[PDB]
Symmetry: C2
């Protein structure tokens, strides 16, 4: 019944990464806008367009990934009243390793709504 | 100072500048403030107008000549920001077919008199 409301773009991003590390599909999809034009690009992939595609992509990644840890560092932000873009480095430590793999870059775009913020786009890419 | 009435007009100008390797025309498409960033394939981001301009100068200066074809794959339209995701097909020299597609996210912001690019994020496709 209850759906979360994120008061700021930072809260949406915090929720996004928490859902990512927990591999929680319900929590993840609560961060995304209830709009069928959302889009999600995973590293080296073509975009997943609309809620069903985005949801299938997270489901597939969460289901196959096994256990990992995630640490994130912000690199830059472009802030407007209606949309906020946050560019971040994603550091994944996989399975039984204790130092992280090379950073993955991500552009995350948050859109304001009357009562809070939601994600409309995630574009991840590797760094040479 | 050129004004672009739609995000599509700004994109057309972006790609014409890109193919012509014209830094002056390219920078005419970007917002005239530091609220901008640009990520070239496999690169870390360039933040602010000066860095973005240095990036395009560096890309245009190193690239040599190429032909460009673009195909729109997705759009997210809102009142003050529009996001276009496109496949970019570069053909280098006498090569028959184009190289594998580069995927790009472009974000346009609405200003008082037109639209301007605030972000370009390009990545390779497996």
């Amino acid at each position: 019944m209850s759906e979360p409301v994120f008061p700021t773009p930072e809260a949406a991003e915090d929720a996004f990464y928490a859902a990512f590390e927990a591999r929680s599909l319900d929590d993840m999809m609560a961060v995304w806008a209830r709009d069928d034009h959302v889009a999600c690009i995973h590293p080296l992939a073509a975009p997943l367009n609309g809620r069903a595609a985005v949801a299938a992509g997270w489901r597939s990644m969460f289901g196959a990934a096994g256990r990992f840890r995630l640490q994130v560092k912000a690199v830059h932000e472009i802030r407007q009243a209606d949309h906020v873009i946050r560019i971040v480095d994603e550091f994944l430590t996989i399975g039984d390793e204790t130092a992280p793999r090379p950073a993955i870059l991500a552009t995350n775009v948050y859109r304001r709504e009357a009562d809070g913020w939601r994600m409309v786009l995630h574009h991840a890419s590797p760094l040479q």
